[PDB]
Amino acid sequence: TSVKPIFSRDMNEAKRRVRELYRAWYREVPNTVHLFQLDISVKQGRDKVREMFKKNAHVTDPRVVDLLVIKGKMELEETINVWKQRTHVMRFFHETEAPRPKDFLSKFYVGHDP
């Protein structure tokens, strides 16, 4: 079984590149929220960024981690330019409900969603 990985040797370089990518996203947020004339506090945006990071913490396969790093770098480039507009940046957020909780009885009233 021969598999050629992207960048990784163990998850140490994975941790290193993802913490540098998070540093880049931290210094990416205030410039963009000032540039696009947005309407959201910096605390909420940074907490949703780190929540999106903490969503996919369950991955140990290093090639998948490399491909996540490359995707995040792509969208950090495309938001550090002015290539993406106000619509996509708000589309990362969810301010328009979408109210659906995970209760059993709530899904039993508005039914057929098991």
């Binding site: 995707k71 969208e75 495309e78 106000r86 619509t87 328009t96």
Partner: protein
């Protein structure tokens, strides 16, 4: 058999057969299939390591010039472990012939980014990266072109369905356009047209 059925030339078939046998003999390191169809268009099926050496051979050598570069696509075939098929298409300015360099590849391991010898392959490789996710190491710029920026999913796969997962609408709540999970107005009905009864007896695969 002669009226309204297109006749062929066995001469071009013999020429392409001898030429493909020649190329298969003189680059043994990566040749796996050299197949010739009925209407004489050559196909060469290649391991994903000899991309740069085989294309540097096939651009030159004064026996197969083939300067003209065309399509690149990686036809999404499941029931395989190497799913995607990178299809180079080459046309000879000097000899008027078409060869299809089909190299095989999997989901995550890169083939070696043919833009080094083919200046037409740049946006082709960027398109394949955007629509599939076939990574291209040693490439100048990989971006998303022919998709939306905030959209992801690599949609020309078979795992991506017909309708997108997201769907835009304007709303006056936040005074802008937002994306929502898809709410179709109709079904996109699915006609089970795959009729039985074996319309081609020659292409029967051996069953188990």
């Amino acid at each position: 058999t002669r009226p309204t059925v297109r006749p062929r030339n066995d001469v071009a078939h013999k020429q392409l057969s001898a030429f493909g046998e020649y190329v298969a003999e003189i680059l043994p390191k990566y040749v796996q299939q050299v197949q010739v169809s009925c209407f004489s268009e050559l196909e060469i099926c290649i391991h994903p390591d000899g991309v740069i050496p085989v294309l540097t051979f096939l651009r030159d050598h004064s026996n197969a010039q083939f300067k003209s570069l065309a399509d690149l696509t990686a036809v999404d075939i499941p029931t395989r472990q190497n799913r995607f098929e990178i299809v180079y298409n080459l046309l000879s300015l000097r000899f008027n012939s078409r060869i299809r360099v089909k190299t095989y590849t999997d989901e995550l391991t890169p083939v070696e980014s043919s833009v080094s010898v083919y200046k037409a392959a740049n946006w082709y490789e960027r398109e394949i990266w955007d629509m599939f996710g076939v990574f291209f190491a040693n490439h100048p710029d990989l971006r998303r072109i022919l998709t939306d920026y905030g959209f992801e999913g690599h949609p020309f796969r078979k795992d991506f369905p017909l309708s997108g997962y997201v769907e835009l609408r304007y709303d006056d709540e936040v005074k802008r356009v937002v994306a929502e999970p898809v709410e179709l107005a109709q079904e996109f009905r699915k006609f089970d047209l795959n009729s039985p009864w074996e319309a081609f007896p020659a292409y029967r695969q051996p069953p188990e």
